[PDB]
Amino acid sequence: KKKCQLPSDVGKGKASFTRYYYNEESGKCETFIYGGVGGNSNNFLTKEDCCRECAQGSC
């Protein structure tokens, strides 16, 4: 489960929306713009689930 620290991927699409993503180097979560083609695992339509990404390792 290395899906805790992935790069930002907004790509293209017509699904202009903000999703939650967890990042390492501190164990924090933020919001990113996602809509269309899914990029990496740095996107989540949920809030709590965000931690789940790293909850399998550190979080």
UniProtKB/Swiss-Prot annotation:
Compartment(s) where it occurs, according to its Swiss-Prot or TrEMBL record: Secreted
PTM text: Lacks the conserved CysII-CysIV disulfide bond but contains 2 cysteine residues at the C-terminus that generate a new disulfide bond.
Disulfide bonds: 4-54, 29-50, 51-59
Domain BPTI/Kunitz inhibitor per the UniProt entry, residue ranges: 4-54
Superkingdom of source: Eukaryota
Coiled coil regions, renumbered to chain: none
Molecular-function annotations in GO: potassium channel regulator activity; serine-type endopeptidase inhibitor activity; toxin activity
Effect recorded for residue 51 to A: 5-fold decrease in trypsin inhibition, and no change in Kv1.3/KCNA3 inhibition
Residues under site feature: Key residue that directly interacts with the S1 pocket of trypsin: 14
Sorted UniProt keywords: Disulfide bond, Protease inhibitor, Secreted, Serine protease inhibitor, Signal
Single GO BP term: envenomation resulting in negative regulation of voltage-gated potassium channel activity in another organism
GO CC aspect terms: extracellular region; extracellular space; host cell membrane
Reported tissue expression: Expressed by the venom gland.
Extra facts: Negative results: has no effect on chymotrypsin and elastase. Shows weak inhibitory activity against mKv1.3/KCNA3 potassium channels (inhibits 50% of currents at 1 uM) (IC(50)=1.58 uM), Kv1.1/KCNA1 (inhibits 25% of currents at 1 uM), and Kv1.2/KCNA2 (1 uM inhibits 25% of currents).
Family under the similarity heading: Belongs to the venom Kunitz-type family. Scorpion delta-Ktx subfamily. Delta-Ktx 2 sub-subfamily.
Known role: Serine protease inhibitor that inhibits trypsin at a molar ratio of 1:1 (Ki=140 nM).
Protein name, entry field: Kunitz-type serine protease inhibitor LmKTT-1a
Taxonomic lineage of the native organism: Eukaryota, Metazoa, Ecdysozoa, Arthropoda, Chelicerata
